[PDB]
Amino acid sequence: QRRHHTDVGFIMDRFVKINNTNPTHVIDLMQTHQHGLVGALLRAATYYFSDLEIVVRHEGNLTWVPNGAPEAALSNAGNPTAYNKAPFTRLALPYTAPHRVLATVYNGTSKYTQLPASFNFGAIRATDISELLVRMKRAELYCPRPLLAVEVTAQDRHKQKIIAPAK
Amino acid sequence: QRRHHTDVGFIMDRFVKINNTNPTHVIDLMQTHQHGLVGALLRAATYYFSDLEIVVRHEGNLTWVPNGAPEAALSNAGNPTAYNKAPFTRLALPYTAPHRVLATVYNGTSKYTQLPASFNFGAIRATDISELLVRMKRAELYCPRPLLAVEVTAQDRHKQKIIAPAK
Amino acid sequence: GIVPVACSDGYGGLVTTDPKTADPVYGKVYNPPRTNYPGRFTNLLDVAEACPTFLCFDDGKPYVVTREDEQRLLAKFDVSLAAKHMSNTYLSGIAQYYAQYSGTINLHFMFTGSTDSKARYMVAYVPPGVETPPDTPERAAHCIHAEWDTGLNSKFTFSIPYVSAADYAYTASDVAETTNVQGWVCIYQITHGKAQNDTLVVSVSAGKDFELRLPIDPRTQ
Amino acid sequence: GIVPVACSDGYGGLVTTDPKTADPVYGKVYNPPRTNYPGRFTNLLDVAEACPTFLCFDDGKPYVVTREDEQRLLAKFDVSLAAKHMSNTYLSGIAQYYAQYSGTINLHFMFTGSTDSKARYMVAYVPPGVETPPDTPERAAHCIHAEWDTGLNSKFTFSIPYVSAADYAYTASDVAETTNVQGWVCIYQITHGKAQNDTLVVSVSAGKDFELRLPIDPRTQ
Amino acid sequence: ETRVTQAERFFKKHLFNWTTDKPFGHLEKLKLPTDHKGVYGHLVDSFAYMRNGWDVEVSAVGNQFNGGCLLVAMVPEWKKFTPREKYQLTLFPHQFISPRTNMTAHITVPYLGVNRYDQYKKHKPWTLVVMVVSPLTTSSIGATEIKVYANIAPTHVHVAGELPSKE
């Protein structure tokens, strides 16, 4: 047997769209769709470590402030500013959260259903952002959690149609 | 003598147009023209194994689901998605079929004149696909089958015009 | 002069799974160490092997109760990763994102009945052969099967062999191909003593040589 | 600085037979083993050599029947890969896809008549010389020829030598160049005894040094 | 999987009656496996997955005073042939049957197909093919007709997945 395709560093190393994008977006890996490939295999772990590569389709210059920087630091070019090329901008970001590893479920709060505001990879700003893709590099997952398959109402099995070359 | 040009790994490794292209096309090598060079040499062998390179001219993003993925998996970008460049898209697809070798003639059926639907290299989807070329990389053939030359009705020979530089 | 290059046509597009890295934007950042962090898994099939999970029987319960009837067939379920009896399984949760698979699948049986009640059980596997599985408790002795009695050790594992035509099999049972896809497993009760409501919980784990092949994104988004 | 490059003009376009590969989209896929799969062929001319195939004579039959007439000439056919007598041959099937060829072509003779009937045959090759091939069985004894007598061994092979002007010869007989293009092989019956409907089937295989050169796509599509 | 030794045994068969009015190209086929009334039939109906080759022997009863030729071949993944490629059936493993020289053919083939195991109730990989190369010619001292026989046996039978009885 050859389990190279079930590797945790291989299956999570692909681009995934983040549906909610704003002019000023805070990059959170929890904003991925819960039923996607990487989205669900991420919800299937309690703590995750990863770098990040983003493909952003924007208008104007894109500024990226690291985690913990004030919101007012997004209006200055001292923070990494990428000038927009023709198709889009493809960057590689580091991990900037103070915690050793991030988490997908938090049991409680952090201020003296909603993860702490410190669980993010930074922020990005432009005049607007049309699409945003995130790619996890050298991802590591900890403490597996239940992973759910699709339910079947009354038929014996889930009947999905496979691609067929039938003429 | 130097028989390098009748080598089975050399003749089959060229691009051939697949005439029938659809917005959702399932890549099957039997869709090659039967009288073309690679097409006829493929029909001349019972079984064949090969990788693939596809040159696709399309509008919108091109998604490729491997052999066996549900047809509903073509609407998601988690599967390998190629964003369209100017001229066309040139990819390299592996052999994804479960069988050790594919077949060109099948004696019978596969369900408890028509090859089973598991003989394909995957499916590709875009808004529309203008043209599609396929290339057989590291092709191997098994169990040779009869290959026919064009017939001549009543002449002594097939009488074809060869290119001449005559002024 | 300088290096002459040929800007090839068809290359250079973004593919959401290309193996090339991006240009760094914020260099020389050292993250906090995470050495010997508890509970790290590098392969989804390693945790599939490690922890078996329960099946979902009729009425939605992880166990089969003894039936006080002439029917000696307690339960019967298809051996597939997209079935009813495997709907709430972690193995199905993994396999829904892969197009093909191959290898052994293990079934683990646990008895949760009272000690003063004794029973004998037999499990049989039927490959995609006969059009009707051997509902008769003796007709099923001719296929691959194993038996175990109840005692102090209420745990017993049964391995479902991988039998099929192709080298690899689909994890995605087709809308076509009616009747038995490949296989069903039948549980038989050889005998039972004073067991009217005694239960038996069935769990399934990936085999030692199980393997999933082609990552896909099949779910509707 | 960074490396400077020159975007050359005229390079980079797609040539449907360029030797450069594409960027992989789906990595680390290991296909099921096909070690020791029976009947693998790596060169078309190998199976052309090992497997002789039949010729298509008049009326569309692969054998010569004895003619009870003064004509001692059993048959005559063009020695070319585009001839009538070679229209249903595997060698012609391969050669139709190449522009040039060179090398020997073997002919295999099989006697399928009754044992109590004996006959003697001669075959001769006529290079592109005389305007009329030697129809009479005496004029042909001056050419390259061989003879074999029928008996227990009904197998006999005869090799057509490659004679032409250029090192390499076309496989795509031209509209021009009428008359005998290159050559005809004639089969003569020296004698026959009580053979009125006895046959002789003729098959052709590629020579040990046959070679085809320039792949083309000549058929209409 | 296990190998069976009791199923590898001969089985006489009648192919056709070789007469004088059948011209060249009279093609007779016999897909394997046929209806086996012995151990092999129970193996087919009581086991699901099997793989095996075939050793075919073919004899025509006649005399040396007749003429004609029979081509016997084992076509993998049989398909109907128009009279054009009947001239090329020598490509598959084959021998000739002609009353002048030989009296009995002998062809052995391995197991081959897209699947490592096959269910012959659906797929029949190998096929016996016998044709008249030259028509049977007879005189006042020759036999007016010849009956040919099949002689076949599965070789190296390997099976997995035993099936229950039907009683």
Which amino acid, one-letter code, is at E107?
Answer: I
Q: In the 8-state DSSP scheme, what is residue A5?
A: G
* Number of Cα atoms under 13 Å in the Cβ half of residue B22: 10
Find, in chain D, the residue whose alpha carbon is nearest to that of A4: D28
| Nearest one of A113, A55, A120, A65 to A88, comparing CA atoms | A55
Q: Is residue B135 within a helix (H) or strand (E), and if so which, with residue range?
A: strand B128-135
Element (H, E) at A130: strand A128-135
Q: Are D111 and D154 in contact (CB under 8 A)?
A: yes
Three-state SS across chain C?
Answer: CCEEECCCCCCCCCECCCCCCCEECCCCCCCCCCCCCCCEECEHHHHHHHCCEECCCCCCCCEEECCCCCCCEEEEEECCCCECCCCCCHHHHHHCCECEEECCEEEEEEECCCCCCCEEEEEEEECCCCCCCCCCCCHHHHCEEEEEECCCCCEEEEEECCCCCCCCEECCCECCCCCCCCCEEEEEEEEECCCCCCEEEEEEEECCCCEECCECCCCCC
DSSP three-state, residue A74 = helix
Suggest the residue from A1, A5, A10, A11 to mutate for an interface test with chain D (most D CBs closer than 10 A). Answer: A5
* Dihedral over Cα of C85, C86, C89, C93: its sign: negative
Question: Residue C80 and residue D125: Cα distance in Å, rounded?
Answer: 69
Residue B115: φ, ψ to 5°: -70, 145
Cβ <8 Å between E114 and B144: no
Place of tokens 């983040």: A18
Strand, helix or coil at E45? helix
What is the secondary structure of A102-113 as a DSSP string?
EES--SS-----
Please tell me if residue B81 touches chain C, with a CB cutoff of 8 Å: yes
The closest of C186, C182, C171, C119 to C148, measured between CA atoms, is: C119
With CB atoms and an 8 Å threshold, state whether C25 touches A64: yes
Q: Does C130 touch chain E (CB under 8 A)?
A: yes
Report the alpha-carbon distance of residue A166 to residue B116 in Å, rounded: 8
Report the candidate in A81, A64, A5, A12 with the shortest Cα–Cα distance to residue A42. Answer: A12
**Rounded distance, CA C96 to CA C81, Å?**
8
DSSP-assigned letter for residue A150: P
- Measured CA to CA in angstroms, residue D50 lies from D41, D53, E11 at distances of 11, 10, 31
Rounded to 5 degrees, what angle do the CA atoms D150, D153, D154 make?
A: 60
Quote the DSSP letter at residue E49.
E
Taking CB atoms and an 8 Å limit, are C13 and B70 in contact across chains? no
Which chain C residue has its CA at the smallest distance from E161's CA? C127
Helices (H), B3-154: 8-11, 37-43
| Nearest alpha carbon to residue C106 among C213, C212, C211, C203 | C203
* Whether D4 contacts chain B with CB within 8 A: no
CA separation for the pair E40, E59 (Å, rounded): 23
Report d(CA B120, CA B71) in Å as an integer: 14
Residue E64 to residue D114, Cβ atoms within 8 A: yes
The answer to whether residue D1 neighbours chain C at the CB level (below 8 Å) is no
Q: Name subunits touching D (3+ CB pairs < 8 A).
A: A, B, C, E
How far is C72 from A14, CA to CA, in rounded Å?
51
* Whether the Cβ atoms of residue C64 and residue C182 lie closer than 8 Å to each other: no
Give chain E positions within 8 Å (CB) of C134. Answer: 164-165
Q: Are E and A touching by the rule of 3+ CB pairs within 8 Å?
A: no
DSSP letter (8 states) at residue B68: T
E114 and C130 within 8 Å at the Cβ level: the answer is: no
Pick the residue of B41, B46, B101, B150 with the most E CBs within 10 A to test the interface with E by mutation: B46
Residue C181 to chain A, least CA–CA distance (Å): 10
- CA D180, CA D140: separation in Å to the nearest integer? 16
C-alpha span between C169 and E56 (Å, rounded) = 33
Residues of chain C positioned with their CB less than 8 A from the CB of D26: 17
Query: How close A29 gets to chain C, by Cα (Å)?
Result: 17
Note whether C95 and C212 are within 8 A (CB).
Answer: yes
Strands (DSSP E) found in chain E: 2-3, 11-18, 27-31, 47-61, 67-76, 94-97, 104-109, 126-137, 146-152, 154-162
CB neighbour class for E4 (10 Å; exposed up to 12, middle 13-18, buried from 19) = middle
Q: Is the minimum CB–CB distance between D50 and chain B shorter than 8 Å?
A: no
Instruction: Let me know if chains B and A touch, i.e. at least 3 Cβ pairs under 8 angstroms.
Output: yes
Dig out the tokens for C193 from the structure: 């003593």
Q: Does A4 touch chain D (CB under 8 A)?
A: yes
Interface contact C3, partner E, CB < 8 A: no
Within a 13 Å sphere around the CA of C199, how many CA atoms are in the beta-carbon half? Answer: 8
**What subunits touch chain C, counting only 3 or more CB pairs under 8 A?**
A, B, D, E
Chain D residues within an 8 Å CB radius of E88: 53-54, 88-90, 93
Tokens of E4: 């069976």
Calpha distance B38→B32 (Å, rounded): 8
Strand order in the sheet with B140-144: B102-103, B45-49, B140-144, D40-41
Q: Does residue C144 contact residue C162 with C-beta atoms inside 8 Å?
A: no
Residue C63 sits at φ, ψ, to 5 deg, of -145, 160
Contact list, D93 vs chain B (CB under 8 Å):
44, 146-149
- Mark out the alpha helices in B26-157 (DSSP H runs): 37-43
Q: Which of B36, B92, B162 sits opposite D217 (nearest CB)?
A: B36
Q: Enter the tokens of residue D42.
A: 């790596």
Distance CA C135, CA D124 (A): 77
Identify whether the C-beta of residue A29 lies closer than 8 Å to the C-beta of residue A136. Answer: yes
Distance separating alpha carbons of residues B30 and A17, to the nearest angstrom? 35
Which chain B residue has its CA at the smallest distance from E127's CA? B107
Alpha-helical (H) ranges within chain B are 8-11, 37-43
The encoded tokens of residue C10 equal 């068809």
> Structure solved using which method?
cryo-EM
- Residue among E100, E110, E112 minimizing CB distance to D111: E100
Q: Which of C7, C10, C168 sits opposite D32 (nearest CB)?
A: C168
Contact E101 D153 (CB under 8 A): yes
Contacts of E109 in chain D (CB under 8 A): 38
Of A110, A120, A130, which Cα lies nearest the Cα of A31?
A120
Q: Where are the alpha helices (DSSP H) in chain E?
A: 39-46
Beta-carbon contacts of residue E122 (< 8 Å; ≥ 6 apart): B108, B109, B110, B112
Instruction: Strand D169-170: give its sheet, edge to edge.
Output: D169-170, D100-102, D211-212
Alpha-carbon separation of residue A144 from A32, A104, B68, B113, C53 (angstroms)? 18, 11, 27, 49, 13
Token match 């952003």: residue? A56
C-A interface (Cβ pairs under 8 Å ≥ 3): yes
Dihedral (Cα; B58, B61, B67, B70), 10-degree rounding: -120
Residue A67: DSSP 8-state = T
Minimal CA–CA distance to E119: which of E51, E38, E36? E51
Chain A segment 135-164 residues within 8 A of B by beta carbon are: 160-164
E32 in Cβ contact with E15 (< 8 Å): no
Residue among E110, E15, B40, A24 nearest D37 (CA): E110
Spatial distance between the Cα atoms of D17 and D14, rounded to a whole number of angstroms: 8
- The angle at the Cα of C5, spanning C2 to C8, to the nearest 5 degrees, equals 170
Rounded to an integer, what is the distance from CA B90 to the centroid of its chain? 15
Size of interface B-D (CB pairs under 8 A): 167
Assess contact for D70 and D137: CB atoms under 8 A: no
8-state DSSP, A165: -
- Buried b / exposed e along B24-42 (16+ C-beta atoms within 10 A): ebbbbbbbbbebbbbbbbb
Query: Pick from C152, C70, C69, C151: which is nearest to C118 by CA?
Result: C151
Peptide bond just before D137 cis, omega within 30 deg: no
> Which chain D residues are Cβ-neighbours of C9 within 8 angstroms?
12-14
Both tokens of D129, joined, read: 């010389």
CB–CB contact B90 D22 (8 Å): yes
What SS3 state is found at B39? helix
Is residue E72 classed exposed, middle or buried when 0-12, 13-18 and 19+ CB atoms within 10 A define those classes? buried
Q: Do D12 and C15 touch (CB under 8 A)?
A: no
Q: What are phi and psi of D153, to 5 degrees?
A: -90, 105
CA distance linking residue B112 with residue B6, whole number of Å? 41
Buried (b) or exposed (e) across C157-190, using 16+ Cβ within 10 A? ebebbbbbbbbbbbbbbbeeeeebbbbbbbbbbe
Q: Does A143 touch chain C (CB under 8 A)?
A: yes
Show residues of chain C in contact with A147, CB under 8 Å. Answer: 90, 93-94
Gap between the terminal Cα atoms of chain C: 53
What phi, psi does C94 have (nearest 5°)?
Answer: -65, -50
Number of CB pairs, chain C paired with chain E, less than 8 A apart? 61
| H-helix segments, E23-142 | 39-46
Does C143 lie at the interface with E, CB-CB under 8 angstroms? Answer: yes
d(CA D25, CA B81): 9
With beta carbons less than 8 A apart as the criterion, state whether A101 and A72 touch.
Answer: no
> Three-state secondary structure along chain D?
CCCCEEECCCCCCCCCCCCCCCEECCCCCCCCCCCCCCCEECEHHHHHHHCCEECCCCCCCCEEECCCCCCCEEEEEECCCCEHHHCCCHHHHHHCCECEEECCEEEEEEECCCCCCCEEEEEEEECCCCCCCCCCCCHHHHCEEEEEECCCCCEEEEEECCCCCCCCEECCCECCCCCCCCCEEEEEEEEECCCCCCEEEEEEEECCCCEECCECCCCCC
Locate B11 and state its tokens. 């003749």
- 3-class DSSP assignment, residue E118: strand
User: Nearest to residue E47, comparing CAs of E77, E78, E3?
Assistant: E3
What backbone phi and psi angles, to 5 degrees, belong to B27? -75, 110
Query: In angstroms, how far is CA D162 from the centroid of its own chain?
Result: 12
Q: Closest Cα partner for E74 from E159, E150, E157?
A: E150
